[PDB]
Write a protein that binds this ligand. Structure first.
Ligand code: KAA
Ligand code: KAA
Lengths: 310, 297
């Protein structure tokens, strides 16, 4: 429609977005959470099987042949390194990068709000996220639903026990579960108020600690509202050995799927060996939250220049 | 060990305070904060810059596309000005493919802002006010490029180019900004960059840089708004690159088309926040004020 040179977001939306950013900063300042800035580029990347990071070449030091750098998909690894270093509760409003096509709710570069809370367990963190959503969105308090309960209610099936065959009614169980969640659960939740889905299957623990009450589940949660996935958080895994092992598992799964394997970030593992204080952390997509807050129809409407015009 | 941050936690705590202080400074003046892309389908032709390059999968149907990391958010901020954003600033992460150094990191934080209807002196006064506040340093001194040469090297630059830059670097920089920041303005028209060339003296451009304690802190211009002249300079840039065996870069058509529509008269300036924080905290290297310098990232 508009000529390419124009921003995809209206001037009024840019002003309203700036107000929301300041509101988010006040929210954390009032709770004593320190703001930090970590790298957008790294010598390492993530093994998470669902992400495709951007790659770029750096001239490197002195007389080097040069070196590959990956753009950061989320500031998590560096923030955990800071936690081990004693930074205390911290948040960050950074630009994050993912090599994936632009969509109504996706841009290859987007703003992430990610923060960590030492001594907070998963529920405690969820309540804080709930507070932030109610404030900037002026929406009602959230509903919380366990992954298992979500499946039973909308698909009349138990994801923690259901048979592979039953699920089909793909030999990889999690892909099957994610398929069912994407088309069978997601479209039905967060309609009247934000929905927190917690206690994902152990296999989808990512960097979250496994539940002490039920080994089949991980202390991970995701927030959905008005059809948009808004956040993803964990009671963080502090065991370096298990973390190293999960990254190895990631690469095995990548390989078996014909996906490139990624180097394991040794800086994250060495930090975890030194010791990360027990904590829970969460990452929320700021553009999506702003889009909902401003009544926008697409992410592009709240981003100065979506990639198609950048 | 390698896992540790390059900046101390206390420095990170003080850096956040300075960032908040910078935001208050602009809020108090009614300057809007904006966030533009870190990646673009175009890049800069500026002969001295080496941008990072990355590949984007793009639309599922396409063959993908090349993207360039932004060396400064100038082009997008200028497009916003044409769209009517008014006075704006940005605290973004900027990228330049250059070796890590005592005063350089391939990714650093830029404080860049634009002031509609401000001539370059009015804008310099504002930069001066910011330095005073953040560094608690004396008000700055201002020297024209000509005056700076005529007194530190007894020679008239406007009547006497890579040479000048070699002279400025060794014959001027070393003795300016010692007791207070030093603004050097009216650089040779030859080094106008995206600045208007002065109509009172065609031998100079309306551009300035500010130095303090031996550190180059900022670079600003009374902005060139003529689309045709800007396009000509970019082509000039690429011919020089070709002459120097450097790659020729695609010119940002969106910037030119926006300038065709009309950008309000304005002045803009880009400042290195990491260098500013380094001075504020009395840190020795940029690495000491950045959570993880590239060697550790
Ligand atoms: N340690 C606890 C936090 C871990 C966060 C984890 N590393 C992570 O990235 N989770 S995420 O779900 O993949 O991303 C968080 C949010 O980022 C937002 N996101 C992700 N990709 C995009 C894109 N491409 N555009 C816009 N927004 C996006 C979205 O709201 C997600 O809920
Ligand atoms: N429209 C008016 C402003 C134009 C600014 C122009 N695009 C520009 O980039 N000027 S600059 O001098 O190249 O950059 C401004 C500041 O960025 C800082 N800078 C530049 N490169 C680096 C690096 N590599 N590390 C840290 N800081 C850096 C430094 O303080 C410079 O004074």
């Amino acid at each position: 429609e508009t000529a390419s040179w124009q921003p995809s977001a209206s001037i009024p939306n840019l002003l309203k977005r700036a107000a929301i950013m300041a509101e988010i900063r006040r929210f954390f300042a009032d709770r004593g959470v320190l703001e930090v800035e970590t790298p957008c580029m790294s010598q390492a990347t993530v093994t998470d099987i669902h992400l495709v990071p951007f790659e770029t070449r750096f001239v490197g030091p002195g007389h080097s042949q040069g070196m590959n750098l990956w753009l950061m998909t989320s500031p998590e690894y560096h923030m955990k390194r800071l936690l081990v270093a004693g930074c205390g509760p911290v948040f960050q409003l950074c630009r994050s990068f993912r090599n994936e096509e632009m969509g109504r709710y996706h841009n290859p570069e987007f703003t992430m709000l990610e923060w960590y809370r030492p001594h907070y367990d998963m529920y405690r963190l969820m309540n804080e996220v709930d507070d932030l959503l109610q404030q900037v969105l002026d929406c009602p308090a959230a509903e919380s639903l366990s992954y298992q309960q979500a499946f039973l209610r909308y698909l009349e099936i138990d994801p923690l026990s259901a048979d592979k065959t039953q699920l089909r009614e793909e030999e990889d169980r999690d892909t099957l579960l994610q398929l069912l969640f994407t088309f069978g659960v997601e479209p039905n939740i967060g309609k009247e108020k934000p929905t927190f889905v917690y206690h994902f299957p152990a296999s989808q623990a990512s960097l979250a600690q496994i539940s002490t009450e039920d080994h089949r589940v991980a202390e991970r949660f995701e927030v959905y509202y008005k059809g948009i996935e808004l956040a993803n958080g964990f009671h963080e895994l502090t065991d370096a050995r298990e973390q190293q092992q999960r990254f190895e598992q990631d690469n095995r799964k990548r390989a078996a799927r014909g996906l490139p394997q990624h180097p394991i970030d040794q800086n994250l593992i060495e930090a975890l060996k030194v010791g990360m204080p027990d904590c829970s952390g969460v990452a929320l997509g700021v553009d999506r939250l702003v889009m909902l807050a401003l009544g926008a129809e697409t992410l592009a409407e709240v981003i100065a220049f979506s990639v198609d015009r950048a």
